[PDB]
Amino acid sequence: VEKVFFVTSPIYYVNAAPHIGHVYSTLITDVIGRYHRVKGERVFALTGTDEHGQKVAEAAKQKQVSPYDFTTAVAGEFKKCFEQMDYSIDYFIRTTNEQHKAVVKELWTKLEQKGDIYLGRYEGWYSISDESFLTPQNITDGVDKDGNPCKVSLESGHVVTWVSEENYMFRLSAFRERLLEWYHANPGCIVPEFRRREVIRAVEKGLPDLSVSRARATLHNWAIPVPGNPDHCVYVWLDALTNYLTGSRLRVDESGKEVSLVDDFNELERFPADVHVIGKDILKFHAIYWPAFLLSAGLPLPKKIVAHGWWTKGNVFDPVEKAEEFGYDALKYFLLRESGFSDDGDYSDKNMIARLNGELADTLGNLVMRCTSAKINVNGEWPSPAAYTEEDESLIQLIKDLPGTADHYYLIPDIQKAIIAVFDVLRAINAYVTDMAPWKLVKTDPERLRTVLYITLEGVRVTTLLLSPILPRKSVVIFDMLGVPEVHRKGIENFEFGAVPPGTRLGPAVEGEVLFSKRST
Numbered sequence: 001v002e003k004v005f006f007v008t009s010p011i012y013y014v015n016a017a018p019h020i021g022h023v024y025s026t027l028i029t030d031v032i033g034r035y036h037r038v039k040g041e042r043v044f045a046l047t048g049t050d051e052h053g054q055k056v057a058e059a060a061k062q063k064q065v066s067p068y069d070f071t072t073a074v075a076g077e078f079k080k081c082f083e084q085m086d087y088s089i090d091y092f093i094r095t096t097n098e099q100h101k102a103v104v105k106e107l108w109t110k111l112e113q114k115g116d117i118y119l120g121r122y123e124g125w126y127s128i129s130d131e132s133f134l135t136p137q138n139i140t141d142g143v144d145k146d147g148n149p150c151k152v153s154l155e156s157g158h159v160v161t162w163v164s165e166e167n168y169m170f171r172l173s174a175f176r177e178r179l180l181e182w183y184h185a186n187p188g189c190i191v192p193e194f195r196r197r198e199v200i201r202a203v204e205k206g207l208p209d210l211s212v213s214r215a216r217a218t219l220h221n222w223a224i225p226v227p228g229n230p231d232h233c234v235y236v237w238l239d240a241l242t243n244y245l246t247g248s249r250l251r252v253d254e255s256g257k258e259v260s261l262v263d264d265f266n267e268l269e270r271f272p273a274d275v276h277v278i279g280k281d282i283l284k285f286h287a288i289y290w291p292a293f294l295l296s297a298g299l300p301l302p303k304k305i306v307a308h309g310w311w312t313k314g315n316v317f318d319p320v321e322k323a324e325e326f327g328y329d330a331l332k333y334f335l336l337r338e339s340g341f342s343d344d345g346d347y348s349d350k351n352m353i354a355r356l357n358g359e360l361a362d363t364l365g366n367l368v369m370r371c372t373s374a375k376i377n378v379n380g381e382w383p384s385p386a387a388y389t390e391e392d393e394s395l396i397q398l399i400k401d402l403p404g405t406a407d408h409y410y411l412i413p414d415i416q417k418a419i420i421a422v423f424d425v426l427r428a429i430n431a432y433v434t435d436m437a438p439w440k441l442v443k444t445d446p447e448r449l450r451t452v453l454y455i456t457l458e459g460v461r462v463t464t465l466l467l468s469p470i471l472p473r474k475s476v477v478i479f480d481m482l483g484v485p486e487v488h489r490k491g492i493e494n495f496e497f498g499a500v501p502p503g504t505r506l507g508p509a510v511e512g513e514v515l516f517s518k519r520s521t
């Protein structure tokens, strides 16, 4: 069924400045968005900020400034950061937005009418820093900034506090069977698979009901009032999760400002999310609470939740800084190549340089220069191939198979594997070039060079197309060197081998141009 491909990041708490975690989550969101746009689909990619709640209000009180001022400023820092990082997110949502607040009230009211919200009590542990309710099994002993004996979260290690409050309760327990049915009927709905197993095991064990309001004093009045009861505020997570629904309902202008909230999500064809990108730290909220709310409201469920191995929240790592040093595309490639769904990845300067030099410069960059060199490509054009050998055909087969292979990986989604698949083809092309030695062929066998050169050019085009969501700016430079017309830089038609006809002219040269400058050890 044709709809707008809808991909999201988490919305980030504004208690603190943007750092690598948020940049990474949003980068994944952006790449998925970009790949689907490259496929020729309609796309709406969403990111933003989570601005209410005890955590933010206490950060504001520490900084000695009003929550309104504080959130607006920090939100500004997130926007600047995401502009600097050269993402292509369609909209930046803030939970302080009045249209979002309206949507939250609608959803709350819907849950209440459905009978799924009642007045009760929460008495138990709470991590303010995670805005999370915890059972006694999920806490243990530890220390605070003052070095005092306190209780901490087993999840996150943050300080926990005992809360005893009359709260509005959501009947989460009533949704256990339906959630299990959903997980089992849609075994690709949570990625990676071991995180899916975790969610299933947790829900199988049983679900308590969930507090969805707090006393207003507790949150320093910095939250959305409960409809028909201004003594209570809406739980920051029901508030926050609802952003995906709000985003799905905002008409947005050319400048990126929201201009209108539609009544019916179907009008914009975005809801529900095709992919919610999150960190492992917020899996329960997105794979248990969120769908339970949607089930209560009779709203459609998201297709995929992908949870990565990082946390969303004297060893600094600043992505803007590193991008200015090593290059923006390069840095993005590294972050997406270096790690899959684990915390198991060497993010040092040494490894960054190793991948820059080895993969980007020596494998990709070298190859681009070879097939566009005046020495080898004497006519500065795509030549017409002669007859193919069996060796030619083996390389051609790999290039033809690549789009389907990379497509599946992108759709999982598993961006690391998609990159590896493309670079496996790039290594193969390099080896082919080394065996055919086109530099010798210029004098020896011009007819044979035509064939070798054409396959090389075409291999570079196809790999680069499939890499364009990862290296958005560098892909443009490469296509410019190859003289690939704009029309051939996107669309599934152009995944096919042979889409750029012989006789196409290469792009102009530059006196000492390089794609990726190698760096010292």
Ligand code: MET
Residues within 6 Å of the ligand: 009, 010, 011, 012, 013, 050, 240, 241, 242, 243, 282, 312, 313
């Ligand atoms: C609805 S996604 C909310 C994410 C949360 N504010 C965090 O930073 O972990």
